[PDB]
Amino acid sequence: SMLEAKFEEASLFKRIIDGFKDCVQLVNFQCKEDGIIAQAVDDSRVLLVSLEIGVEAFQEYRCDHPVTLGMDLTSLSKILRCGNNTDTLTLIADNTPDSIILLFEDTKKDRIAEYSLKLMDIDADFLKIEELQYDSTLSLPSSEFSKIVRDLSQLSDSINIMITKETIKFVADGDIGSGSVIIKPFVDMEHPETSIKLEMDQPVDLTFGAKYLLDIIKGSSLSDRVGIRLSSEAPALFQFDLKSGFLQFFLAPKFN
Amino acid sequence: SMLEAKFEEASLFKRIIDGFKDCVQLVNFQCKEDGIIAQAVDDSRVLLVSLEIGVEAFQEYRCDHPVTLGMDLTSLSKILRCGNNTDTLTLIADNTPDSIILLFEDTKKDRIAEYSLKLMDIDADFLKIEELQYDSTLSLPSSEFSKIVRDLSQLSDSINIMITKETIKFVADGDIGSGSVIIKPFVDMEHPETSIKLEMDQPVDLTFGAKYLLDIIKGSSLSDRVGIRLSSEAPALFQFDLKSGFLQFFLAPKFND
Amino acid sequence: TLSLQLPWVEKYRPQVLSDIVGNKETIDRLQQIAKDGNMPHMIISGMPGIGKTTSVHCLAHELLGRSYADGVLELNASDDRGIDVVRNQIKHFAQKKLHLPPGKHKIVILDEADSMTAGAQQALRRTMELYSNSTRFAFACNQSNKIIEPLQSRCAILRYSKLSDEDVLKRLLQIIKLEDVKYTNDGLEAIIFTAEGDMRQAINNLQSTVAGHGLVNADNVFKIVDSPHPLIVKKMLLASNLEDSIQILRTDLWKKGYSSIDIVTTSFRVTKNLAQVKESVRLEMIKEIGLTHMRILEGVGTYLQLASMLAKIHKLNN
Amino acid sequence: EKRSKENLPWVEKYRPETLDEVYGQNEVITTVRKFVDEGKLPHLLFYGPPGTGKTSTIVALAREIYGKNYSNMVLELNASDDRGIDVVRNQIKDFASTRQIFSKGFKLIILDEADAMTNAAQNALRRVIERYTKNTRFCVLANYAHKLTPALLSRCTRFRFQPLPQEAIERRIANVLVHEKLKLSPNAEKALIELSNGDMRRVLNVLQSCKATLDNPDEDEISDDVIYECCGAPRPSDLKAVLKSILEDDWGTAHYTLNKVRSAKGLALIDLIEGIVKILEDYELQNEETRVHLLTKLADIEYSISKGGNDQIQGSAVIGAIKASFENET
Amino acid sequence: ELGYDILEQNASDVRSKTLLNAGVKNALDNMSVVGYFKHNEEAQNLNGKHFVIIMDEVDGMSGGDRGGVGQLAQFCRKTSTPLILICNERNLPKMRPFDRVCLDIQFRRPDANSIKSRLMTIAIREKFKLDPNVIDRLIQTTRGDIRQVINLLSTISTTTKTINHENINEISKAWEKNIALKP
DNA sequence: TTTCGGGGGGGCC
DNA sequence: GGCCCCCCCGGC
Numbered sequence A: 001s002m003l004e005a006k007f008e009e010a011s012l013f014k015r016i017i018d019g020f021k022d023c024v025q026l027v028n029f030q031c032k033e034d035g036i037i038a039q040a041v042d043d044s045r046v047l048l049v050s051l052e053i054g055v056e057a058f059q060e061y062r063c064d065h066p067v068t069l070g071m072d073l074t075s076l077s078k079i080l081r082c083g084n085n086t087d088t089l090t091l092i093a094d095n096t097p098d099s100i101i102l103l104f105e106d107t108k109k110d111r112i113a114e115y116s117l118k119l120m121d122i123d124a125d126f127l128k129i130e131e132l133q134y135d136s137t138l139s140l141p142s143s144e145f146s147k148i149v150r151d152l153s154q155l156s157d158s159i160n161i162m163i164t165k166e167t168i169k170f171v172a173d174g175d176i177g178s179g180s181v182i183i184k185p186f187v188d189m190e191h192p193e194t195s196i197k198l199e200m201d202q203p204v205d206l207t208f209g210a211k212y213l214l215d216i217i218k219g220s221s222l223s224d225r226v227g228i229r230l231s232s233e234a235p236a237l238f239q240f241d242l243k244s245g246f247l248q249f250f251l252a253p254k255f256n
Numbered sequence B: 001s002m003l004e005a006k007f008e009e010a011s012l013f014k015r016i017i018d019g020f021k022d023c024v025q026l027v028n029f030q031c032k033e034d035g036i037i038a039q040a041v042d043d044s045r046v047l048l049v050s051l052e053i054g055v056e057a058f059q060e061y062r063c064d065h066p067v068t069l070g071m072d073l074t075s076l077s078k079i080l081r082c083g084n085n086t087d088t089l090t091l092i093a094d095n096t097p098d099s100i101i102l103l104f105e106d107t108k109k110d111r112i113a114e115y116s117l118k119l120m121d122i123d124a125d126f127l128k129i130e131e132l133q134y135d136s137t138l139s140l141p142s143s144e145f146s147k148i149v150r151d152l153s154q155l156s157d158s159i160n161i162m163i164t165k166e167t168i169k170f171v172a173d174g175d176i177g178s179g180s181v182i183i184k185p186f187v188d189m190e191h192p193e194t195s196i197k198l199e200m201d202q203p204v205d206l207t208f209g210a211k212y213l214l215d216i217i218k219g220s221s222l223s224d225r226v227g228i229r230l231s232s233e234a235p236a237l238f239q240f241d242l243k244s245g246f247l248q249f250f251l252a253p254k255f256n257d
Numbered sequence C: 001t002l003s004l005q006l007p008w009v010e011k012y013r014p015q016v017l018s019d020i021v022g023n024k025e026t027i028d029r030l031q032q033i034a035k036d037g038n039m040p041h042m043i044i045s046g047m048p049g050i051g052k053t054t055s056v057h058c059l060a061h062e063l064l065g066r067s068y069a070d071g072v073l074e075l076n077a078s079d080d081r082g083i084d085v086v087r088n089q090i091k092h093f094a095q096k097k098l099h100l101p102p103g104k105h106k107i108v109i110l111d112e113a114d115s116m117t118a119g120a121q122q123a124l125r126r127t128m129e130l131y132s133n134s135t136r137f138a139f140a141c142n143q144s145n146k147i148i149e150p151l152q153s154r155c156a157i158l159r160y161s162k163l164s165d166e167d168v169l170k171r172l173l174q175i176i177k178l179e180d181v182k183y184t185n186d187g188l189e190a191i192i193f194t195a196e197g198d199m200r201q202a203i204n205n206l207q208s209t210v211a212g213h214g215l216v217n218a219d220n221v222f223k224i225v226d227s228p229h230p231l232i233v234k235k236m237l238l239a240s241n242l243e244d245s246i247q248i249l250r251t252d253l254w255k256k257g258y259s260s261i262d263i264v265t266t267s268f269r270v271t272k273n274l275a276q277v278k279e280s281v282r283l284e285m286i287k288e289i290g291l292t293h294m295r296i297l298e299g300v301g302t303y304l305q306l307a308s309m310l311a312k313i314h315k316l317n318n
Numbered sequence D: 001e002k003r004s005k006e007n008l009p010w011v012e013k014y015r016p017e018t019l020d021e022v023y024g025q026n027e028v029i030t031t032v033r034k035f036v037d038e039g040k041l042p043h044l045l046f047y048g049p050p051g052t053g054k055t056s057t058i059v060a061l062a063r064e065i066y067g068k069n070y071s072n073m074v075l076e077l078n079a080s081d082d083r084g085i086d087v088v089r090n091q092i093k094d095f096a097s098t099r100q101i102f103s104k105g106f107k108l109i110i111l112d113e114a115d116a117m118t119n120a121a122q123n124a125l126r127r128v129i130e131r132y133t134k135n136t137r138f139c140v141l142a143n144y145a146h147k148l149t150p151a152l153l154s155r156c157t158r159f160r161f162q163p164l165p166q167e168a169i170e171r172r173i174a175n176v177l178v179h180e181k182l183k184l185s186p187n188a189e190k191a192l193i194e195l196s197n198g199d200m201r202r203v204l205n206v207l208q209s210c211k212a213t214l215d216n217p218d219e220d221e222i223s224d225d226v227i228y229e230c231c232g233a234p235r236p237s238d239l240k241a242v243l244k245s246i247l248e249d250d251w252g253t254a255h256y257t258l259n260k261v262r263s264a265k266g267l268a269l270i271d272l273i274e275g276i277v278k279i280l281e282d283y284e285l286q287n288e289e290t291r292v293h294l295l296t297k298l299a300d301i302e303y304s305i306s307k308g309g310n311d312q313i314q315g316s317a318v319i320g321a322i323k324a325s326f327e328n329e330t
Numbered sequence E: 001e002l003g004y005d006i007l008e009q010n011a012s013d014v015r016s017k018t019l020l021n022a023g024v025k026n027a028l029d030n031m032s033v034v035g036y037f038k039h040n041e042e043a044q045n046l047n048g049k050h051f052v053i054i055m056d057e058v059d060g061m062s063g064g065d066r067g068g069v070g071q072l073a074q075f076c077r078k079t080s081t082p083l084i085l086i087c088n089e090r091n092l093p094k095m096r097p098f099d100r101v102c103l104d105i106q107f108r109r110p111d112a113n114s115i116k117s118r119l120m121t122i123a124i125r126e127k128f129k130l131d132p133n134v135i136d137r138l139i140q141t142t143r144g145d146i147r148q149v150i151n152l153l154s155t156i157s158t159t160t161k162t163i164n165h166e167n168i169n170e171i172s173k174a175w176e177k178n179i180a181l182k183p
Numbered sequence F: 001t002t003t004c005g006g007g008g009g010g011g012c013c
Numbered sequence G: 001g002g003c004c005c006c007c008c009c010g011g012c
């Protein structure tokens, strides 16, 4: 077995999968000697998911040469649900793989469960996510953002984020009135987690649909602070930092 | 009356009937002086159900001569739903009866509900298919078996069970992929209710339909443990023991080809 | 007594394309495709007992070798093949990743594709196109008209012809040689005569003989086998006199146990395809036969009604 | 059932139990017995008219193969049970793809009256039959072969059940008489066979009715008269007299004779028409148009009678049609 | 050719009102992340950032797609991006909702003089002889179907290396397209 | 257009 | 998972 990844517990893998399972259907992993990366484009070709897990998230990791594995989220989630939460999950793949093996091992009951998942053929090349000079780099706690988007989605089907001098406006003009929320740079010492920081360079005003933002916030439980990078005209970058790695959502804006 | 059998709580009989109502259509009870033994065969002639409620499960049980009662489980369940879950249930029958009387009595009040279900002329024998010497006999908690069956049935419509020396393997091979679960015998003196026992004579490898196992696992609500007995050239036995009787599912394996 | 013997239809089902008799051109094309590869989307059409399923299975087996169990998805009328099945299971199979020799592809066999609904056939359209570099489709049907035009456009048409007497005789002689079955020429001629180009029926009757009486001769075959009643109906409807037609109807059909509805339906079908009689006469005969058929359907099915139909037919043909 | 077999109708009381109790189908019985005695059992099809012994034969064969417990080792379906596409795809497939529960052996599926099944179910049955042939055998029973699809017929070995012969009917009648302690006159047996039309059910029903008719069956003998009164059928003498009067008397005499003959025993006109047709089909008519007119007009009258109408007008039409048709003889 | 990014939905997708109003709808007025991340280094390629919706096989929308036709008709009049619908037969009652909400473009059967050079090129590359005089006949065999005629050439060339007048009759008779006639 | 019956495919629950 | 409803064929 050329790829022999071994998570400490199956909780981590299932949590990352659930972080972005509801927005995509097919995913493609490159596993190398440095870790695992994944890029997925939604059926609507609007939302891009970019996940990477470093070698520090695995108790053991070995990969002779790079491996590309195409999989479907539904089947992977179904196979993962079978194994218990408190087991050791090993991802095994051989040379020129046609399927990926998931081994759930419980050392207490001494139980081994092997599930082989057939890989899909995905030809779409990964889009080069080259570093962008984002005009605005907002960062806010996960709970605040989750609550704000959930509340605003009920009023309107899309929300406009405006970043200006010490001002963050989540306008939600729509069918139900024009209820909006406003925040300003805030800092706390007792709990630095609740530290809203703004690093604007040029004023930003970008509107995004409610469905994609709802899907993104669905993964808020996977982190504590969300980093929202916005530009004058470019996809917005929503970053959740993991214990070892990250999960990004690139969401394209709407016309005008 | 010829036959009078009282259940202290109607929930007992409702639960027993609920354990095998989703796999058979017509049931045949045959009451004796040593309890009530019932059989039911499914429409596909692939699964058989045998229940042997004993006399110790009734407050009082009186039966003069053996009496046969052919019934439809749908109507029986329909009427049993009528009665409350806090009333005593008397099963009453007469000599060569034309109907079976279910009498729900609530001691709290003076309300008595009598339901007469017309019987069917079901003439069949049991044949006592309990092949003497099996090839393997395992016993394990019903919860683990139910979990394994539910997990594997989602992969394929067929499940293969292999019994080897100190090894029990459940395998499913579907379209999206395959899944294998291996369990070895172990014992815990602290909590023997969770132990797994295996007695082996010759290796076994038998395939079964997932639908029938999904139907069978519904009996786990009656017993905390399940005993599976397997033997080549014979149907597989799935036994759930009860307070005084048991419920047995005889499932025919699929042809290998 | 409780052990069954494998029927000759399954015991000698061709396992290689070289053992399929008839349709020499198409079989040669399939053999060359197997030799080279690059199997295209194809639709094999024909009539019962000619070797369509055998041809498709042999082609798939010889093409995919050891990878038959992983690169072949077979579905028939005994399996659910609705819109959901096409949109999920077949799509997943086509999108599956599998390593195969240079010029080999996964095969999706849809036996009896005629029964498939229009929705499933429409859904298959873009699936056969987006994944044509890894998966190919082989439909087998009896009536090609039941397959929608867009699907026919994407596949190669392979219309099979009925096996001639020579090919049936060749395969039958091979089977006899393998099973060492005593036979006579007249028995084989009778078997072919009853077969009507159906190899399955020929083999079944050959087994019934030998199994029933032993030596294969016309006598035993006709003792167990009956001459096709359509020929009897044709002879009845072509008799020069009403007396002869009534005699045939009584002796050969009514006293043999054939139902009136069967007789009238066969008469209709035979009259439809009597190329030796003028079209107008056939149309008048069909009108009379339809009147009699309606009377029989109403419930009045008797020998007298069929006799009256024959009398009216002879009235017209005079 | 209830009580002993003596409470059952004769049609069911005398149902063949073994394969040696089936009469009139010697060839088919011998062939199936040889097939079962050597393990060479193919997919069988039994095509035949009503009351010939197809169900009895298949049940007897199943009993021979399995034994007294055949009901627990076969899948029998008929027109009373739903046999849709779902049934074929689930129940039949499960039965064919699974081992026997009770005792080892192959699986037998008896689709009685398969001509009532829809085209979709028959089409779905094709690969089901062809794929599990190693461990399962299919038997089909039919009265109308036009309802069965060509493919299903191609997959089955056909056996034709002929109308029951005269000798077989006499042997069965002899057995029934011996068991029932009855006496039957030779002419009574002749009439019974003639009216049976090759159906044993009719024979048994008419014989039971005749036994009921007799006041003291213990020593009374069944005569042709008993059959005629029981069934209400015209006597041959009555038909001959009616035909004679129609053919060589004037309209008034023919009308009077027909009315008197019918009112003597309340005979029905349809039975008279059938009897006269049978008598005339043996005549040697010089001219073909005579036979043509007879057949056409009598068929029209029979069809009209089938839907009610006026009885007197129908009888007069019969008389006039016969007279006009025979006028062509010259 | 115009630089637009293609979003496609075929009959293999369930195009019902419930999922149509929750899927492609959002893309009617949204940019393409693929376009931005793929054309970031390009210049003057504005269309790269836009969407072009292609609904293929609209006539194939069976009962599995409830209310899809009406939703497509509504989108046709309220779409912010170019939308192209493809169907085989336009004169069905079921296609009435698109009566006067789209620009209708008819594609007629190509003539035998339009694909002639293509057939010579295919013959030259595939190393088999195709006499031009029998090309026309083939077009009538498939009723002006280019895919069908190419498939016919591929299948016949497998064993027959010459398509001439001595065998064209057999191929034409064995590959005849049986199209059901109309009222 | 159109008088039952069977099958499919979606919508409440 | 199960009713409940609507739509569509039906010969060879």
Ligand SMILES: Nc1ncnc2c1ncn2[C@@H]1O[C@H](COP(=O)(O)OP(=O)(O)OP(O)(O)=S)[C@@H](O)[C@H]1O
Pocket: C008, C009, C010, C012, C013, C014, C019, C020, C021, C022, C046, C047, C048, C049, C050, C051, C052, C053, C054, C055, C141, C142, C171, C199, C200, C203, D151, D154
């Ligand atoms: N060309 C053939 N050569 C030898 N045997 C044949 C041939 N065709 C049919 N048979 C025999 O008949 C049996 C059945 O053949 P099939 O391939 O099932 O016919 P089929 O045309 O596919 O049936 P349909 O169209 O679904 S009714 C085979 O197993 C063979 O034993």
Ligand SMILES: Nc1ncnc2c1ncn2[C@@H]1O[C@H](COP(=O)(O)OP(=O)(O)OP(O)(O)=S)[C@@H](O)[C@H]1O
Pocket: D010, D011, D012, D013, D014, D015, D016, D021, D022, D023, D024, D025, D048, D049, D050, D051, D052, D053, D054, D055, D056, D057, D142, D143, D172, D200, D201
């Ligand atoms: N060959 C026979 N020998 C003796 N009795 C017969 C025979 N055939 C029919 N019968 C009698 O008639 C009764 C009915 O016979 P069946 O087996 O039901 O005929 P069947 O041909 O299967 O009826 P159909 O075709 O479904 S209307 C039997 O109980 C027998 O008593």
Ligand SMILES: [Mg+2]
Pocket: C052, C053, C054
């Ligand atoms: Mg076939």
Ligand SMILES: [Mg+2]
Pocket: D054, D055, D056, D112
């Ligand atoms: Mg019968």
